[PDB]
Amino acid sequence: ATSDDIASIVNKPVTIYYSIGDGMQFSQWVGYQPMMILDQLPAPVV
Amino acid sequence: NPSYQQSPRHFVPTGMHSLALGTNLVEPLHALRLDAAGTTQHPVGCAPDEDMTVSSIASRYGLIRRVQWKKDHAKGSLLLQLDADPFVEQRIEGTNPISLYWFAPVGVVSSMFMQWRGSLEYRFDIIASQFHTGRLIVGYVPGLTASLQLQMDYMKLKSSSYVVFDLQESNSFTFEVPYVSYRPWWVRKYGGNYLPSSTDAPSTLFMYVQVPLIPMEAVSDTIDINVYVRGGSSFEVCVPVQPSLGLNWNTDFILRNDEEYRAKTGYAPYYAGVWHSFNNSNSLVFRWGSASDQIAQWPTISVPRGELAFLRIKDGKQAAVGTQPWRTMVVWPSGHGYNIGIPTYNAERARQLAQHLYGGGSLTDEKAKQLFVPANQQGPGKVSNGNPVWEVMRAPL
Amino acid sequence: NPSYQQSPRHFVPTGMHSLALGTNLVEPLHALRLDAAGTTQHPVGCAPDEDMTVSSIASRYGLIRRVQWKKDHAKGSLLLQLDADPFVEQRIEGTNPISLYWFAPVGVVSSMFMQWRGSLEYRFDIIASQFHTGRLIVGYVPGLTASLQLQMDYMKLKSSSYVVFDLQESNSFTFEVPYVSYRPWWVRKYGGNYLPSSTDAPSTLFMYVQVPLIPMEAVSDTIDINVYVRGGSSFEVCVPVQPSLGLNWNTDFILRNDEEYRAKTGYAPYYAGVWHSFNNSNSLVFRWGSASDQIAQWPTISVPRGELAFLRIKDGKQAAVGTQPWRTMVVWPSGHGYNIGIPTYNAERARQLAQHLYGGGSLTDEKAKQLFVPANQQGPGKVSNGNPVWEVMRAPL
Amino acid sequence: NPSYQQSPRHFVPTGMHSLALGTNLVEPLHALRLDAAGTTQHPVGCAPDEDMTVSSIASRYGLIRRVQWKKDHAKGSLLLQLDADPFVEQRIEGTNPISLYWFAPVGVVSSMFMQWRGSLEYRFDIIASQFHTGRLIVGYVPGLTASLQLQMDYMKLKSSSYVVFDLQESNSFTFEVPYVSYRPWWVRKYGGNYLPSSTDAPSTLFMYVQVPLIPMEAVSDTIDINVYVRGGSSFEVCVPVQPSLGLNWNTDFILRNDEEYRAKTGYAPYYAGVWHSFNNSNSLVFRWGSASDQIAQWPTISVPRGELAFLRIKDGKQAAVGTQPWRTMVVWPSGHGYNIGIPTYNAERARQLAQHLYGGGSLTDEKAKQLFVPANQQGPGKVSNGNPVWEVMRAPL
Amino acid sequence: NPSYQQSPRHFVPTGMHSLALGTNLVEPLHALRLDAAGTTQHPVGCAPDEDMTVSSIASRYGLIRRVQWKKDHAKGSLLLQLDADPFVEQRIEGTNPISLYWFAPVGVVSSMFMQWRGSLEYRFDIIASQFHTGRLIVGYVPGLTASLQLQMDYMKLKSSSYVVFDLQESNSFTFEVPYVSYRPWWVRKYGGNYLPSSTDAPSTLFMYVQVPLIPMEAVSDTIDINVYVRGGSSFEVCVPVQPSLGLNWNTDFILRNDEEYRAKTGYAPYYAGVWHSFNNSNSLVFRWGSASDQIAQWPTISVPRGELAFLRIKDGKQAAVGTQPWRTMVVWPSGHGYNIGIPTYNAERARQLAQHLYGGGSLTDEKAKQLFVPANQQGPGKVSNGNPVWEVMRAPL
Amino acid sequence: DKDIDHCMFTFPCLPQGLALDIGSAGSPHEIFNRCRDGIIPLIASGYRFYRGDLRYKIVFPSNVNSNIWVQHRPDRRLEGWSAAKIVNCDAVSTGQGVYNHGYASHIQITRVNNVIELEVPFYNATCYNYLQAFNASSAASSYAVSLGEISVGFQ
């Protein structure tokens, strides 16, 4: 798009996805780093 | 060129290949690979050492607990009572509001699944000299509700399945926790940030000091004991859902308190600008964009009657900057069904303007327009840094 | 999940399966039938008695004519000279402007086709007692133009192919009309309402009284004769086009005389309404719709100079009704490139308004606006019944 | 109803089947034929006599030339020197600016192709009595540029390939022109109306009177000779492009001189109309359409400073007609980035208006609006006939 | 016509066939070729002499260097130390800011690839008479960083792999550079104009005069030596990326300095025009187009407070021309969220206007409008030549 | 004011690549200004001749709906390395500026899709064409470069 048209595109969302595409291969095992529990996350609070 | 007079096929278009699917399914793509049929290949020295697999991970002990076990402990004394679920915890002393936690690998991998079943295993390592001697139950009570989580002793524990052990020569063993539930599987303990639908563990482990330790004088009374969780051979999960866990890589979070005020989503960054519908662009007004009618829209302040309010940014640095940074603002309805934000020179002009508008005076009124900031002040027309918080400067009218 | 890297197919979309096709062609559909492969089935008692087929119909006599044949007829006397085409006529005494007509089935089925060829057949039934005796030619002249349609006699007829017949014992027979044309087929006699491209019949039948009837005194001098058309065995048609015929089921028609005036197509029903561009909706104007700028548009009246005109509906019942039915109207250009219709209280206000506008006065003028009907009069805002005819009330100015 | 979970195909749509292709290629269509698999069939009496084919045409002589050959001609005398290309000419005495030309069929068929190659043939018919006797070279010089086209004689011609012939008994023969070029094919001599890319013939034919005619006194000194071009057996073309020729069926052409003035393309027919942005439709302005803002747009006249101009149609008959035909007009910018055409009563009102606008006066000015033609004058609102030429009535200001 | 009731296919559309792919992949097209299955064919005399291939090119020496080798050189003396990478350089004395460079073909072909590996080859041609005699190391040090690029001598060089050579009879040879890196491949030395991600060569070649030349008195002391790079047999590249090189065919470049001012992209060419929102088109304003609201938009000048500025084109020839070329302009906000450019008669009117607008005065003000150029001045309405640079005429206010 | 007949623009169709267009100093085409040349021409640099075809796959602007036609004109000779480039045809004079009959052509429907995928056949009465930048010399030599001349026009 040219700059005259490009304005329509402003602040438009662009999601991106991904997955490993079959050929992917992880290698060496490593233990996990410490986790953070999700339902333990704070409420937005009124 | 024979005509192909025969009837055309009759499908239904859809815009996207399935996401959730990921098995016996060729998945068409626009490869950026040059070769039409090329594929990543693993050099024999680069061969995949690890066959990633649920069981392959689940079959790995992680340290989960570190009981201290002193000589003086009573024969009835409990050591621990962690739940019979993969999701055993190990809190770290994270000073962060979101404390981190160690997990056995099995718990982590379990966290990605709604349901799970099968036995677990707890290797116990009684780090002790041979001369130390003792004995302890490690029982397992099926079906304890938390109210019944108490009332326990080793003796009631004996009513259910349990295993006594004698520390003397060999100083370690491995208990194997039974899977016992009305349910063929078992729902995840936690879930995505969503407290309901977080069923607790079917049953609970216990471990009491069945015979108090009897150390020689030449060796320490205390004895460290370590507990290693691991998925049992029977262990397995099924349904994939949102993991209930997050990496420590970015332990950051943002509360959505409403107390702070700022521009509506999709309307930032905004800049002091001009707009023909507003004072014929003779006065500045925030715009999230350059094309006409890209005025920044603003949430409606709840001003109790007899008062007034006007915005004042909590950060001058994030303020959109015309000839001056615009730290002060008065939000008022566009008359087009939304609330524009009007930059002001100061908290005072904004105040007086609020005295006007909440005084029921119109934007059209000279009292307002004099308080309106003239288009010439737009200067560079710098955008606001992101969507900066605006303090709500309420005042009585 | 192998990637399917191979190139995608490359068609051309079209929105619809072919219509004209109807043979060796599977025709995909959204069946409302529940079963995926279900199909209508005919119970053995419901079996299709009739194999519908062009020949199957064509091989059926229909009465087409009823000659009277009196004793006194001269040996030269003609009885009939109907054309050698399937499209033989039999007018009914329909008082309707569109008179109906009987047809032999063969003519009807022929009417659906541009072209036809092959022999025809005329069974003749001389409803007569055996005692009656007579003789008559039924000849066939190829290639008669209508100018040559006359000049005929049985004798010139004899120059071409013909068949004499002797009424005595057997009182009926069947002539078989030859197909003789330069053209392998033959164009339809008529066509869809479209006079050109309506070629006449190749040739014409005749029947003269070769020997005058000689009845006994004890039997009637007149003898009814009936003529039955039917497709010959050779008979056949080919190209399918618009039938040149209509069912009697709805012998109704509408002339498109232009003399009557009414709203442009797609602009009815219309209702007295309001429109911001017109007097700021302070006065009524016909709208074919509710959404803004759905003003009914109107054809331009041709008013000769020095005059004026204003509409007045020929039916008050069909008038759109505000507070009052709007039987009177003045059409004037919108100034937006079309002619709005403006409701008026009466033929007079409309007149005065015409005196104004054709007086060159503007709609904007007070003289007009006073004549404009105020928005309050819209009342129910009832739509006009369909697109009612408006009488054009012309007056000199 | 099993679900079809497998991945969908992944094409690329395109809107149209290929045009240029026309061979081993099934070409899908919406046949209007009734039968799904029906096809035109040729009756044995209607059988295609002609196998249309490039060679099939190329192998046909056409008369191309008519040399006169008098007795008195010198032995050196030339008869003709037409080029060794299929595109031999035969001008007709068309009085038309576009003179017509005869062509040998081979030249015509050649005209459709960019390239060609192979031998040609020139049958020569020396229409002469046996008693006439003579002799003549018909040589062929490869590679003549036009500068070298001259300097020729039969003798230099002899340096290259040539054929002597002796007119005595047999009075006709057939020379066969060689194909000799650096290029395997040969570019077309002409092309679509596009002078560059019109390479001339590789080589040139000649024919000189090698021995002057020696007629008997009892027979004429002059002898008609005719020349018949035809594609040689070797002859062939390849690449299909725009034919460089046109049928005589419609020898009509239109120069695009710019001197005449008329409405922009797509803006005709136009009619005097009204337009709310123009004088609030209180005055007429040309519209190419009825829907709002379908104002006819007009090319900008180049008026040198200190002057003015106004349009006046060269044909009153083609003028759009309001209450009057609008033979006079003033084009001025819309102020919306295009030039509207404003109808005027006369060349004078248009003049005065030009005196105004080129006087720098605005359309808004009363001087203009008085000259503007009032909406009432729109009358029938007849469209202009097509896009009639407007004379530019320039005047000094 | 059976109905095809079965379920329709269920794809996913995409607008384009893959680009990056180019191998085992049929690639559908709209051939402009006439034949459906036709293909370019190579005449046996036109047969492809060259099997284009990476190795086929890489296996070609190019001269890369021309060492002079005088008699007097010390035995320790270096001759060259070019890097052990395909991207060896040979600068030309291009006076152009972008100096050109010779490359060995192998370097060029290498430039198209991110990665490469394998041996190289340096033929050495010691252009010398047999009587000249000498000796020289051509060693190879793996793994030199540039800091270690110095400190070198032939002797340290000897610590790594090297080859001594004796110039006497045969006067030329070919060293073969080893590929030695931790990395199986090796990243490109340069890249597209993008300095980071431009890793240097793994290792470096050297060549010292191991034994100083000992020429006879009857022959020259200096000896030319030439160095020819070529891809080794082992040599190969892999990943295709943007070549880091450009043809000399058009050694032209354009710096994007911001100092010059001109219209926003997509808004040129622009012409003095009129616009109803601007002074009701009563005054000229630049338009990049004719349709309404195709006003040329302009970048915001950064005028420090207390000043003013106005544009003045650096080229009158490129100026859009109304009645006059418009060499002077004042850019001001549209009030519609963008900056229009307003043509002025001169730098002065533009100045005064700046005195106004930067004086905070409005466009609406008479002081401005008097300075506005009237629509009549639009004249031809010639467009600006491209997007000409505008000088920024700043002045204090 | 282009008539429907008019080609919107034209260009020679040659492997070598068009003469590089940095664009104006006012409006640089950064990709050539910066990402100089490109691969295919770069390899074309290594050879003096070529024979064969070309693919193109033009991409039209999306916003427009209008149907789009594309002529191929082999007939046109390229002339000098100058004007080995895109050209915007203007007022009709010759048949050059308009749609033409015999030439092969194809029409994309933007509303269906805004990207045509062309294939250009080799058509020359030559063994094979020049491959380096072409200064011309022989008048015949002018035909001996570009496969022809593609042209495009909106309806």
- Burial class of E268 by CB neighbour count within 10 A (0 to 12, 13 to 18, 19+): buried
Rounded Cα gap, residues B189 and B85, in angstroms: 8
Longest dimension (CA), chain F: 45
Rounded Cα gap, residues D54 and D109, in angstroms: 7
The experimental method, as deposited, was: cryo-EM
Which residues 1-46 on chain A approach chain C with CB closer than 8 angstroms? 21-22
- Show the CA angle centred on residue A19, arms to residues A18 and A21, nearest 5°: 125
Cis, bond preceding E269 (omega within 30 deg of 0):
yes
Closest CB to D375 among C10, C24, C333: C333
Token pair of C13 as six digits: 């979309």
Could you tell me which residues come within 8 angstroms of residue C45 by beta carbon, excluding any fewer than 6 positions away? none
Interface contact D19-F125, CB threshold 8 A:
no
Beta strand pairing call for D134-137 and D236-237:
unpaired
User: Chain A contact for B91, CB < 8 A?
Assistant: no
Rounded Cα gap, residues B376 and B380, in angstroms: 10
Q: Where are the alpha helices (DSSP H) in chain B?
A: 54-58, 105-110, 154-159, 347-357, 366-371
Interface contact E297-A2, CB threshold 8 A:
no
Contact C252, C260 (CB under 8 A): no
Q: 10 Å Cβ neighbour count for D201? A: 17
**Shortest alpha-carbon distance between residue C4 and chain B (Å):** 4
Q: Where are the alpha helices (DSSP H) in A2-41?
A: 3-6
Contacts of C362 in chain D (CB under 8 A): 282, 375
Nearest to E344 by CA among E370, E307, E317: E370
Token pair of B393 as six digits: 């400067």
Looking from the CA of E91 toward its CB, the CA atoms found within 13 Å total 7
| DSSP annotation string for D285-322 | EEES-SSTT-BPEEPPP-PPTTEEEEEEES-TTTS-BS
User: Chain D contact for F141, CB < 8 A?
Assistant: no
Report domain extents, chain D.
1-251, 252-397
- Show the CA angle centred on residue C209, arms to residues C204 and C210, nearest 5°: 100
Contact C320, C286 (CB under 8 A): yes
Interface contact F102-D241, CB threshold 8 A:
yes
Contacts of C11 in chain D (CB under 8 A): 11, 13-14
Closest CB to B3 among D5, D10, D29: D29
Rounded Cα gap, residues D141 and D84, in angstroms: 9
> In what helix (H) or strand (E) does residue D55 lie, and over which residues does it extend?
helix D54-58
Nearest to E117 by CA among E58, E30, E35, E38: E58
Interface contact C1-B26, CB threshold 8 A:
yes
Nearest to F49 by CA among F141, F149, F151: F141
Measured between CA atoms, the residue of chain C closest to residue B9 is C28
Residues in chain E: 397
Q: How far is CA E332 from CA D245, E268, E300, E353, E395, in A?
A: 58, 17, 8, 10, 16
**Shortest alpha-carbon distance between residue E265 and chain A (Å):** 6
Interface contact B3-D22, CB threshold 8 A:
no
Measured between CA atoms, the residue of chain E closest to residue B280 is E335
> In what helix (H) or strand (E) does residue D349 lie, and over which residues does it extend?
helix D347-357
Rounded Cα gap, residues E337 and E343, in angstroms: 19
Residues with their C more than 2.5 Å from the N of the next written residue in chain B, i.e. before a break, are: none
- Show the CA angle centred on residue E303, arms to residues E297 and E308, nearest 5°: 95
| DSSP annotation string for B10-60 | -----S---SS--SS--EE----SSSSS------GGG-------HHHHHS-
Contact C271, C382 (CB under 8 A): yes
Give the best residue of D1, D46, D274 to mutate against chain C (max C CB count within 10 A). Answer: D274
Contact B209, B74 (CB under 8 A): yes
Rounded Cα gap, residues C156 and C142, in angstroms: 12
Nearest to B355 by CA among B299, B392, B396, B327: B396
Resolution given for this structure, in angstroms: 3.5
Beta strand pairing call for E3-4 and C27-28:
parallel
Q: How far is CA D300 from CA D265, E320, E378, E382, in A?
A: 13, 16, 11, 11
Rounded Cα gap, residues D117 and D181, in angstroms: 9
Convert E165-176 to b/e letters by CB count within 10 Å (16 or more is b). Answer: bebeeebeeebe
C271 secondary structure, DSSP code:
E
Nearest to F2 by CA among F60, F62, F61, F69: F69
Contact E118, E179 (CB under 8 A): yes
Token pair of B22 as six digits: 């990921």
Contacts of D15 in chain F (CB under 8 A): 107-109, 111-113
- Phi and psi at D224, nearest 5°, equal -65, 135
- Phi and psi at F72, nearest 5°, equal -115, 125
Q: 10 Å Cβ neighbour count for D369? A: 15
- Show the CA angle centred on residue C29, arms to residues C23 and C31, nearest 5°: 120
Query: Does the CA dihedral C291-C292-C297-C303 come out positive or negative?
Result: positive
Instruction: Report the phi/psi class of residue D235: left, alpha or beta, with left for phi > 0 and alpha for psi in -120 to 50.
Output: beta
Rounded Cα gap, residues B271 and B384, in angstroms: 6
All partners of chain E with 3 or more CB pairs under 8 angstroms? A, B, C, D, F
Sheet with B328-333, edge to edge strand ranges? B297-298, B339-344, B328-333, B307-313, B390-396
Interchain contact A/B (3 or more Cβ pairs less than 8 Å): yes
Rounded Cα gap, residues B224 and B126, in angstroms: 6
Contact C228, C122 (CB under 8 A): yes
Token pair of B233 as six digits: 């051979």
Q: 10 Å Cβ neighbour count for B114? A: 16
Contacts of F20 in chain E (CB under 8 A): 247, 249-250, 252
**Shortest alpha-carbon distance between residue C360 and chain D (Å):** 6
